[PDB]
């Protein structure tokens, strides 16, 4: 039960930190719909690619 | 120009364009062409790129010259008005965008075809057209707006 509590208290520091950076990946780019994102951050470093 | 209507029980439900090399006809419409020399066209289905078989001989070839890429955002001769943009279609006013007039070409200042309309009956206060475009070197791209009904 200590093994499933350390995992569950560290899996909630994933989505608190990975989705924190994933919001910071895209918010300087939905503010700029007239500029093209770099291809490194389009798929690899940040998830969401260019749409239309 | 030279564009043909498609007959379905005596009424018009689409327009078929011809470009030098291959004719065009939208997938969402149906009926019979209005030409004896276009009655022998081998019809076939395709993807959303709207590819038809242009098996017409040399007799009526070189009708509408194709426009290349690097299209400027300037004036374009729509049949029922004018379009002025490049990346997407310019917001044409209300009234236009009815039904049964698919496939109408958007011409240029020199009488060259650049896009073929496919859908977008109504979006609200304005009207966005889903057309086919050539991106940078001539690769044909089908571009659509959010929630565009075929037309």
């Amino acid at each position: 039960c200590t093994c499933v509590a350390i995992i569950m208290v560290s899996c909630v520091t994933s989505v608190w930190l990975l989705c924190r950076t994933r919001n910071l990946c895209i918010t300087p780019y939905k503010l700029a719909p007239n500029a093209q994102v770099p291809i490194l951050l389009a798929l690899l470093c940040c998830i969401k690619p260019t749409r239309a | 120009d030279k564009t043909f209507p498609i007959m379905l029980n005596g009424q018009v439900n689409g327009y078929a364009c011809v470009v030098g090399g291959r004719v065009f006809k939208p997938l969402h419409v149906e009926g019979r062409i209005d030409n004896e020399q276009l009655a022998a066209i081998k019809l076939k289905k395709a993807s959303i790129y709207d590819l038809e078989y242009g098996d017409v001989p040399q007799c009526m070839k070189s009708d509408t010259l194709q426009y290349t890429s690097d299209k400027p955002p300037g004036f374009y001769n729509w049949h029922h008005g004018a379009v002025q943009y490049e990346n997407n279609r310019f917001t044409v006013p209300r009234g236009v965008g009815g039904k049964g007039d698919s496939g109408r070409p958007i011409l240029d200042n020199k009488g060259r075809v650049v896009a073929i309309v496919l859908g977008g009956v109504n979006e609200g206060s304005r009207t966005a057209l889903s057309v086919v475009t050539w991106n940078q070197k001539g690769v044909t791209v089908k571009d659509t707006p959010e929630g565009s009904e075929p037309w």
Partner: protein, 49 residues
């Protein structure tokens, strides 16, 4: 018989080479087909923008 015959007591080394060729090559011929549809989808997606 002193021994006990099993299910795989008859297959030789040459017969198992034809089992692996008939299984490995034809299964990989669908993997080439399955990787082909995931490549031209990526090409046509890059033509959109």
């Amino acid at each position: 018989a002193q021994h006990t015959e099993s299910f795989t007591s008859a297959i030789s080394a040459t017969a198992w080479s034809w089992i692996k060729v008939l299984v490995g090559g034809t299964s990989a011929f669908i993997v080439l087909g399955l990787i082909a549809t995931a490549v031209v989808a990526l090409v046509l997606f890059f033509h959109r923008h």
